[PDB]
Each structure stands twice: as structure tokens, then as C-alpha cells.
Amino acid sequence: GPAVIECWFVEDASGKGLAKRPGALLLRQGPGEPPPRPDLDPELYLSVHDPAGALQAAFRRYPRGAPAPHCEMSRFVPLPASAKWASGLTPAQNCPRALDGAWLMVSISSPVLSLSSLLRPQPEPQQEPVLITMATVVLTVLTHTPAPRVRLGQDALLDLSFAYMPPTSEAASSLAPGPPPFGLEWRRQHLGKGHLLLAATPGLNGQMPAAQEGAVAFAAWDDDEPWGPWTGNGTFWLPRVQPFQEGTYLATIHLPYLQGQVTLELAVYKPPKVSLMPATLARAPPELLCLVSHFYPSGGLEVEWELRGGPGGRSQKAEGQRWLSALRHHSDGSVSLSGHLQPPPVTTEQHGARYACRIHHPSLPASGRSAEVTLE
Amino acid sequence: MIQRTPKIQVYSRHPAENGKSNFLNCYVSGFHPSDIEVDLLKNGERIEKVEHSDLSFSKDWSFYLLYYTEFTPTEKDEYACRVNHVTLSQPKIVKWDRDM
Amino acid sequence: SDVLELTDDNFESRISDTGLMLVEFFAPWCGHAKRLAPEYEAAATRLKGIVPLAKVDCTANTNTCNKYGVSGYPTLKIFRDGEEAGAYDGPRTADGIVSHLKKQAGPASVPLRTEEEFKKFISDKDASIVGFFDDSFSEAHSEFLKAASNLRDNYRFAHTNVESLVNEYDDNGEGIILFRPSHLTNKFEDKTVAYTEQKMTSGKIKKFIQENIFGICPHMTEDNKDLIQGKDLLIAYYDVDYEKNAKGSNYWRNRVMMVAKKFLDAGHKLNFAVASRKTFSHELSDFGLESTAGEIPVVAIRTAKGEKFVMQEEFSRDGKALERFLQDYFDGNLKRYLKSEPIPESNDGPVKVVVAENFDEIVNNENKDVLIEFYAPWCGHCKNLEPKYKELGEKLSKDPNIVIAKMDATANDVPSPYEVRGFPTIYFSPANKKLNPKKYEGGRELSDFISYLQREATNPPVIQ
Amino acid sequence: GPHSMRYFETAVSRPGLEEPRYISVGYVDNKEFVRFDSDAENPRYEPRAPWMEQEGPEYWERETQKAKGQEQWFRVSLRNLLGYYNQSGSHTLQQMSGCDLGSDWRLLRGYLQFAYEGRDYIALNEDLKTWTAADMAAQITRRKWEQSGAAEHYKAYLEGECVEWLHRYLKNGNATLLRTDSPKAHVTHHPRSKGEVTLRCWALGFYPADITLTWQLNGEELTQDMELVETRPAGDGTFQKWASVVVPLGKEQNYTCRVYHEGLPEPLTLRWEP
Numbered sequence A: 001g002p003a004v005i006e007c008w009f010v011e012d013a014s015g016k017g018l019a020k021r022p023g024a025l026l027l028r029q030g031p032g033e034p035p036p037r038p039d040l041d042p043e044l045y046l047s048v049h050d051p052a053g054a055l056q057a058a059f060r061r062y063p064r065g066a067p068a069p070h071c072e073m074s075r076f077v078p079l080p081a082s083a084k085w086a087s088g089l090t091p092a093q094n095c096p097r098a099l100d101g102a103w104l105m106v107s108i109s110s111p112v113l114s115l116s117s118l119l120r121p122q123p124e125p126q127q128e129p130v131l132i133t134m135a136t137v138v139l140t141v142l143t144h145t146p147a148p149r150v151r152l153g154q155d156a157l158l159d160l161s162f163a164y165m166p167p168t169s170e171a172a173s174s175l176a177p178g179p180p181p182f183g184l185e186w187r188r189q190h191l192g193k194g195h196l197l198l199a200a201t202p203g204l205n206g207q208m209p210a211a212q213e214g215a216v217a218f219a220a221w222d223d224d225e226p227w228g229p230w231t232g233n234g235t236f237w238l239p240r241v242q243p244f245q246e247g248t249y250l251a252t253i254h255l256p257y258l259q260g261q262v263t264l265e266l267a268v269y270k271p272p273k274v275s276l277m278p279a280t281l282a283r284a285p286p287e288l289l290c291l292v293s294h295f296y297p298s299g300g301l302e303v304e305w306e307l308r309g310g311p312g313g314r315s316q317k318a319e320g321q322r323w324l325s326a327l328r329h330h331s332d333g334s335v336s337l338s339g340h341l342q343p344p345p346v347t348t349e350q351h352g353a354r355y356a357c358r359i360h361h362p363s364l365p366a367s368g369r370s371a372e373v374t375l376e
Numbered sequence B: 001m002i003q004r005t006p007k008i009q010v011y012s013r014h015p016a017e018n019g020k021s022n023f024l025n026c027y028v029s030g031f032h033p034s035d036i037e038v039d040l041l042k043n044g045e046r047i048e049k050v051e052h053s054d055l056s057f058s059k060d061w062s063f064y065l066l067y068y069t070e071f072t073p074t075e076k077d078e079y080a081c082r083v084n085h086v087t088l089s090q091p092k093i094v095k096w097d098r099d100m
Numbered sequence C: 001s002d003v004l005e006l007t008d009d010n011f012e013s014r015i016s017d018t019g020l021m022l023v024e025f026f027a028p029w030c031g032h033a034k035r036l037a038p039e040y041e042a043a044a045t046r047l048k049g050i051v052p053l054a055k056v057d058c059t060a061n062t063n064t065c066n067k068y069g070v071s072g073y074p075t076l077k078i079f080r081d082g083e084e085a086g087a088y089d090g091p092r093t094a095d096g097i098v099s100h101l102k103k104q105a106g107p108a109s110v111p112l113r114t115e116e117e118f119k120k121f122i123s124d125k126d127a128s129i130v131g132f133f134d135d136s137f138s139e140a141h142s143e144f145l146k147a148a149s150n151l152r153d154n155y156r157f158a159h160t161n162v163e164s165l166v167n168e169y170d171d172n173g174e175g176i177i178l179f180r181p182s183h184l185t186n187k188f189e190d191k192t193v194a195y196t197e198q199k200m201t202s203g204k205i206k207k208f209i210q211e212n213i214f215g216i217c218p219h220m221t222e223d224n225k226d227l228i229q230g231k232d233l234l235i236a237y238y239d240v241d242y243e244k245n246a247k248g249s250n251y252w253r254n255r256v257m258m259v260a261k262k263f264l265d266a267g268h269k270l271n272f273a274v275a276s277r278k279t280f281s282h283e284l285s286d287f288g289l290e291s292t293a294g295e296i297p298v299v300a301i302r303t304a305k306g307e308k309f310v311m312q313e314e315f316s317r318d319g320k321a322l323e324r325f326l327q328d329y330f331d332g333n334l335k336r337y338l339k340s341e342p343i344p345e346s347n348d349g350p351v352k353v354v355v356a357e358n359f360d361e362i363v364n365n366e367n368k369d370v371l372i373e374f375y376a377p378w379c380g381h382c383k384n385l386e387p388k389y390k391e392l393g394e395k396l397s398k399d400p401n402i403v404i405a406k407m408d409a410t411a412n413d414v415p416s417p418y419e420v421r422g423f424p425t426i427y428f429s430p431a432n433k434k435l436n437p438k439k440y441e442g443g444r445e446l447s448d449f450i451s452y453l454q455r456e457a458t459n460p461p462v463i464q
Numbered sequence D: 001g002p003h004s005m006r007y008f009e010t011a012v013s014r015p016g017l018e019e020p021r022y023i024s025v026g027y028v029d030n031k032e033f034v035r036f037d038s039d040a041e042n043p044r045y046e047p048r049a050p051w052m053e054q055e056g057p058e059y060w061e062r063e064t065q066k067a068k069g070q071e072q073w074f075r076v077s078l079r080n081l082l083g084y085y086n087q088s089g090s091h092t093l094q095q096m097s098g099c100d101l102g103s104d105w106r107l108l109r110g111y112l113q114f115a116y117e118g119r120d121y122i123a124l125n126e127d128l129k130t131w132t133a134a135d136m137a138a139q140i141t142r143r144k145w146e147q148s149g150a151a152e153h154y155k156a157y158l159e160g161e162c163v164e165w166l167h168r169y170l171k172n173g174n175a176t177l178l179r180t181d182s183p184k185a186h187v188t189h190h191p192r193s194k195g196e197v198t199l200r201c202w203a204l205g206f207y208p209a210d211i212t213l214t215w216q217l218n219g220e221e222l223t224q225d226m227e228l229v230e231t232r233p234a235g236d237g238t239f240q241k242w243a244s245v246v247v248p249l250g251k252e253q254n255y256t257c258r259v260y261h262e263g264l265p266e267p268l269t270l271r272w273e274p
Ligand SMILES: *[C@@H]1O[C@H](CO)[C@@H](O[C@@H]2O[C@H](CO)[C@@H](O[C@@H]3O[C@H](CO)[C@@H](O)[C@H](O)[C@@H]3O)[C@H](O)[C@H]2NC(C)=O)[C@H](O)[C@H]1NC(C)=O
Pocket: A160, A161, A218, A233, A234, A235, C380
């Protein structure tokens, strides 16, 4: 229950460069006046009213005593969607008068939630009782899976839900019953590669670019209420995820001249299995080969060498020259590599003294995995 | 930010025959950012006078270099490529194996 | 030079001083407005000594902007005598705007002061409506001017007092003649048509014009398309161009009329037209004639209700292909054209693929119950259902009265009787009640389905 | 086969009063052919392949002038980005731009992209009309570029000039760019553990680098355990790669290595030989 979320206001500073300025979002609890914030510019202190109740419900579940979420807002002017697949959502060469006035896009992000909301603030801050700027939420889009980790070869279910409360109009209400058609776009951009994975326009059955990589989405409104507000779902289902499908997933809910985007970092992993054998054919001790097989990602692997003492004795970092192999690649996109130890000429008895390699990798527990040479 | 640790391969340009001349390569690639330290090593010591390509650029935003020197492989001599980068807790060493 | 800046404070006052004005209602944020800005300023400068161009920022001036019902930006409306006189829907370019207001600048009805002026006026590519009066002092003349002002956007009006003309085209110094385009004259109708009511009123004139301006088969163009489309109407599309292929344009038009006459004379009711495959290449996508666009005409019909019927045979030069087509239509023996995939080759079970072409053959085969699933290829619910819906087909692969069916509703038009709100939407059309089919709205689980087929299914169901 | 032209620009800020180092390198296929480097005294574009020596002084003048313009653009961009992300030494801003052609030598895809700190910042999508931008800085950039029709300018550049120049460079440098050096392949034998032997299939001397090495057991594909190394440059303009598979000693000849490459009329098939 944050109640107040501190936020950066980002502005195009005279076109010379972007600059951030302190603000805050106050989720209206209802009874009680807002806290005075004389540290804040009243224009950037927003009393947020959310008829849809998606923004406010997102932070009621927020684990009390968790770190504050990162928050950014900026001004934006409504533009039509330039994408072909989304052309039917605005089939006229005019702009709605309902979108008159100022607009803010809020983006809130944390390990548990990433959210984007389109707000309409009043042009001037309320002067009494507290200097605060009243604002209302039009569109909210958010994922409860902002950084999903998926086992190589498993399905990935990327959470997405949204809410919309048609913006107030000067006059000439739609008088059109039913939630209006929207658009949903799922795309991936990662290390210079980008693909439209799925596009859909529920409420307009025109042909959409084919979905890719076995992807589908649960793209729908939740109800058929004749007036609103309305909530919806855009959850993305990507089957049997491979490494090439890792990276940033961008999900955008499109309504006429209004775009709401959230992003997700999909990480693919496969834990490394480790084994230890004498490199040479049962070979000046024989060279030891710590084989680390079929893991992803390739980075993060640390190969530790230890000489484990017998009864009484204990583990010590092993001595002698050590190095690595090159990476070897497999069909599934996983890798294997081998570590190498050349122990020095044994110059002392060491009952129970066994050599072992320990590996660490983000896929593993902190303690890692290890292997001693199989004394077959 | 996305930092990426260098991938390394160390190999001769032609199949090594002992006593015949050849070129020892160290291919370092798929790293970010571009600041990197590479050195070929003969029996522990730095092979000085090693020549490298200029910094190259991949479609994934990663960089790559090829470090090389001419060399005559014997049986006793052992060669390696030593690499350091910000992604690494300590320098990474990859030993030349003429069958790889 | 400049656009006039009108506000809620000085709109009513300055709207009168002109006798028309182009008023652009806008908001500074509208990109359509942003690009219009320099084109509108370019227009204003070139039309400075003719018509004034005004602009109203609606964020500021909400009252005047609502006064004329503005919902979007930019809205451009012509105000003559400070009164709404229709919008401007041409292109948002300086060339477009100055072109249009010029026509609007002149009088509703052009005075023809000589016979030469008269001859010039009727040599137009479009029709002429000409009033013949002894002078300006009749109530008939006043009614003609009233009609002319009312309908000036749709038709060309003129009047004359020239004695030679008044006496050749009327018998009491009060007449209206409609002159159809010269290059369009034919053996199936008259060049001219006279107004024959006894009293002349703006109302009766409009009726007279509407009912007689085009004839049996007009040449549809960008101008008249709105006036022609609306009722059951057949268009034959080809390389119609009266400055290049006149003989060719006449030939096909004559052959259309020749056939049209046969049916019209028999009592059959249908409107006809010809139109350029070039000028209207867009309309072909509604019919599927994008590929078919050569010298030989192509034909398609659009009923007032919305149904479309497309001629499949090639248009024979003798018109017999067009005769058969039209014969099938009036008999009710032509299947309506609809967005469809290629109907597949086998279509064995357990589930029956359903495109719009074979829809009514499968889903509306009466005495045979149909469970129809309207799916989308991208929908996850639709993906979850797929193996359950196929298993349902298998457990019903002996009962032929019960057919399990699916159709990609993103790739195929859904007929009017059915409606797909979201995905998936599943309909069940009874043995005989195919006209009023009802939704499923049950749980999407195999057991829920077969338990539902044990109820609505009129015939007993075969669980396998 | 397919072909491509790509220009990679790169600015790297240096801690202190120093100015960023701007390198701009052009590639055809994976072959560098021009380079500019701010650090080099007398920074101008130099030819990096011998087939570019044809272009006269007016080419290098125009191209060098563009480079110094970009260097200035990158200089201000780096400072701005430094602002928004609140960093103090060394930061990296990258652009990539170019055009892929198919075997028909026709536009198969066009690219205009940026990255800050090795992370995609903003990218022109495949439709050459819309942009992908993750965070709020790039979203703000994307709204500016949409309102200025940046995409239209780049669609026109990439769709016409990019292919035009690529056609010219392909014809002028055909003797090396349309060359097809065939892979010399051979299999090696290495005892491993007990009753096991690693069979390594080599492919040496091959350009282009596009290559597939596959292993079989009685004409059946072996995917699960098969090990590949990345294609690597020999340093003489050619390329190297290998694929390995473990097999029991005595059952070696039941396994075969097939290679696929442009220079091959049909794919090679190999086995281990004493
Ligand atoms: C958006 O749509 C997706 C897909 O429909 C929703 O994911 C689904 O959520 C339901 C729960 O609401 C899951 O049901 C599961 O049932 C088992 C068995 O009773 C239970 O153990 C689980 O805890 C869960 O309740 C379902 O498996 C899951 N995925 C599907 C249907 O493929 C998602 O919740 C929707 N988001 C909304 C509505 O905000």
C-alpha cells in the first residue's frame, strides 16, 4: 500500500537534452485530504483518480516494506498508430476532439510489476486546500511477470492485463454500446534482432500478420458492459522457448490515438551438469578435465579448483596451472566447456586427498555444483 | 546496459606440422563493451610483437578482434591466449590444442 | 494573405461580413491540422481577393466549436450568409481548397445572356439543368433559384431570358429542361427531358432531377458516385475514357444498355452504370476483380441491403454472358460473394473445415445439426480448445446428423445470422431453426459440450 | 546467395576533458571495405579493400565530410544520454544502418538502429515505417522522429541508394565478393575415456563462411550430443569450423559427416580413415 509513489518527470529540456525533475503520484484513497508537498512543484504532484481501478489495485497487493518502484512520467501528444495491422482502429483522416487537453504517460517498474498508464492532468494545480494537480487515468497496461525466467525447452507465459475508461468528451458521446475494438502487439527486440511476434485487433476481424514461433495470446475484454470502465487481457504464450528467443519483449495495447506499452526481460537458462576425469588416457600427476556440459547462458560460469583433504584435513584451493577450453555449441542452443588443471608433482602423502572442481552459474544455487574424480 | 563476456578460440591457421611454419591465432568476439586486453603466451611468457586487426563490429552490437603471430610449433612448446575484460573477475586463459 | 483568427468572442459577428467563408475548426495538437497549416495559409493568400479563410482553435473557443457540431479535426465548413452550407471533404491541399471554393464562389444558377453562352454551358461533360423564363418576376423563377441554391453542390444550374431560347424549350415562359451529356447520347433514351408538372416548386424540381438526370446507364465518376450508389446497382468496370477510347467506351455501354433494356422491359427492377477500372480500382477488392481488369468489361452487383454478386463468365461481346448472369440474379440463383480462403480439397473429419464459400452448404444444410466454432489463429483460448473440439468430433464420427465444424473468422466473412464478439464464439444451429441460431456460452470442456449436445440436439446424439 | 551492406558507427566517451572516439566502418557481406577513425591524425575515410581504390577524390571528400558530421551528432547525443541515465567514465553509443538483399539482389530487409551501453535504444522496424523503443528516453525520441517523418527519409535512403551503392561495390569487388572457395574437409580420431572415441569433422579453407556440418549414424541425424565450434577466420581471408561426436571404438565407420556449402555442387560425405 504505497499510497504515494515518488516519480521523475522527464522533459525535453529546450531540445538541448532530457532532464529529470521530482514529482509524485498519490493514489486517491477517498476520505482525507492529500499530504502537502512543498518540496514538490504542484504541477508534478498528481492526485490520481482511476475509475478502472487497475492502477490502484496493482499497488494494494504490492508487498508492504518492499523497495519503492522506479517511476517516470512525461508529456505526450496523441498520435495515430503508424502500423499497417492497426490501421482499422482509426479509419478516418481526422483526430478525435475527446483527446483535447494535456496527457501524461506514467511508467512504473519493479521486480514484481511493470506498469504504464495514460493520465489526463488538469492544466493548473488546485490552490486550496493543498497545492496538488488533479488527474484521471484513461488507459493502464501492466504485467505481473516483468522478468520471467524460462527453462530452455519449456513454455513461457507472459502476463498482461489492461483497463480503459473512455476519456470525457466536450459533447456528442459515442452512444455506441459495448467495449470498443482494441489492438495488441507483441514484439521482441534483443541484441539487434527484432520481430513482430503477434498482432490482433479484437472487435475487427480483418487479417492480421501471421503469428510467429507458435505464439498465441489471450487477447480479449473481460466483459461486454455497454458503458465501462472495461478490463482486458493480453497474455502471451510462447511454446518450447529456445535461447534465440531470449531478450526484451514489448507489449503494446492500442486504442484510437492511444498507445500503452510495457516491456519484459525473458531469460532462458539450463543448469550445467559437471563431471571430473583425468584428461589423458589414465596418464607428474595426470591433467584433470572438469567437463561442464549442456548449459545456458554461456556467461557466468566460474570454474573453481579445490584439493579436498581426507579425514582431519580440509578443502584448499588446488595448485598448478589451470585454463579453459573454447565454447562448444549444441542443437538446442546450450553450450558445454571444459576446465583444465595440471597439478604439480606430488611431494607428500595425502590420505583421502581428492581433487574436485566446483562450478557457479546463475542457473545454480549459491553453493554451486561439484565433482570429484571417479575412483572407478 | 548489456555487457557481454568475450568468447575465445585459439588455433593455428593451417594444421600444425612440427617444425613447419604457421600462424597462431586468437579470435576474441561477442564482447561488450570494447575495451579489451589480449595477449598470446608462449610457455607462460607474453609473446611480444603480436599483431592484431583493428576493432570490428557485429550486427548484435558486439565487438571482435583477431590477434595473430607467425610461429613454428614444436612438441614441447605450449601456447595460450590470455584475455581480460570488465565482465571477468580475473583474466581468462585458453590453451592452444592443435586438434581443436 | 492571412487566415482570419475567429474566437467564441467574434464568430457570430464576423461570420456575416463576406458571400461565403471557409472556416477550419482545429486543435494545435492534431497532426492532420499541423500539416494542413501551410497548405491553408497558401490557399488563403491565393484566394485573398475572392473568399476569406478562417480558423478556430477549439481548445480555446469551445462554444463556437460545439455550435457547429465538431467531433474531429480538422473540420472545414463553408459558411455563406453566416449559415452552415455543408462541409469540405476534398484533399487538405492548397490546390484542392482554391479549386473547390472557386466553384462555390459563383452564383447557384448561372445566367445565360446569349444563345452562345447557352451552347457553351451544355457542352459540359456533366448534365445541365436550365430554367427558361421570360423575366425574373415569376414565383416559378424564384422557386428555380431556391432549388438551384439547395442542390448547387450536386448539379449544374442555369437560367436564361433569351427570347429565342425561352420559346424553343417552353410554351408559357416557364420551363426547365434537363440536358444530359452530349458524348453520352444513345438510342435508349432522350438527350433532353422536360419538367412537366403544372406548378414549379423547389421540392418538385429536386424530385424531377433525381428521377431523370442519369438515365438507364450513367457513366459513374468521382463527382456523381454518391448520387448513383445506394440502391440495387450493377457496375460494368472497363477502360472507359471518352478522350481516348470513345468508340470503345460507347460499345460496352451500349451492350450493357441493350441487355438492361430486355430485363427492365420485362418488369425487373435494377439500376445500371459504367465506371473506369482505373478511377475505381479500389472498389474491385470488394468483388475480387483486381486481377481481371483489361479491355473486356467486368461486372458485379451491390444490393441496397449490402449483398454482392459477381459475374463469373467472361463478358462476351454479344452480351449473352451478361444476359445469363442477370437471368440467374432475378431468379435467386446466384450465390453472394464473400471474403473467403480457398475451399480445401478433401476436408475429411473428424472436424469439418468451413470457409465462407461452403458455409451455407455445411452449416445451413437443414435436417443436419451443426456445431460451428468461430476461431482466430492467434487466440490462446482457441488453441486450448482445439484438441478438445477435435476429440468431440471423433466421439460423433458416426452420427451424420451431428457435424462438428470450425472456421477462421479472421480469414472469412461471418454471415449476418451469426456474430463473433471475441474468440472463441461457438454457435449451434438446430435441425430446422437455421435462421435463428443460438450461442453456446457454456463451459469450454469436452464433457460440457457432449452434455449440451444431449439437450439442444433435436435428434438423439451418438457418443462414440 | 544473399548479400548485404552495413555501416557501423560507434562513439566511445573517455573519462575526463577528452572528446569521444568515433569509428565508422562499412562492410559488404562480412568484409570491411571503408573505415574512419577520429583518433588517427588527419581523420578521413580510407579504402580497406583493394576494389575501393577506383573511387576518386570527390567520393572520399563527400564521405569524409559526412563522417565528421556524424561525429558531431554522436558527441551531443552521448552527453544527452549521460544526462537522462545519471552516470558520471566510459560509455558507448552505436548506430547500425544498411540493407540485406536476397539471391535476386533485391531489398530483402533494411536497417536503421541504435544502441547505448550495448542495449537496443531505438530501431526502425522491418516495415521501414515504425520504430521499436523500450524505455522512456527512446519513447520520447520515437515520438519526435514520428512527428518529423524520420522513417520516410530513411525508407527512401535505404530502399534506393543503399541497394544502388551495394550493386556497384558487388560488381567492382566481384573477384573476391562473388568468389566461392570450397571447404577442404577431413575427419580425425581421438581416444576418449573407456571404449569411446571422439570423431571430429573439420572444414578448412571456405568463403563464404555460411556452412553447415552435420553428423549421422546410418543416415540418421545426430543432434542431441553433437558439439560445434563457431565458424572462425583463418586470417588469410578463408574460414574454419568443426563438429565432433562421441562413438565407441570399433563402431566408427557406422558414422558419416556431411558438409553443406555454396562452393559444393552437392554436399560432401566423409568418414574416418586409418
Ligand atoms: C489472462 O489469460 C490467461 C489465459 O486464460 C490466464 O491464465 C490462466 O489463469 C488461470 C487462473 O485465473 C489458470 O487456471 C489455473 O487452474 C489450475 C487448476 O485449477 C490452478 O491450479 C491454477 O492456480 C490456476 O488457477 C490458468 O491455468 C492460466 N492459464 C491458461 C488458462 O492457459 C490469466 O490469468 C489471465 N489474466 C487475467 C485474467 O488477468
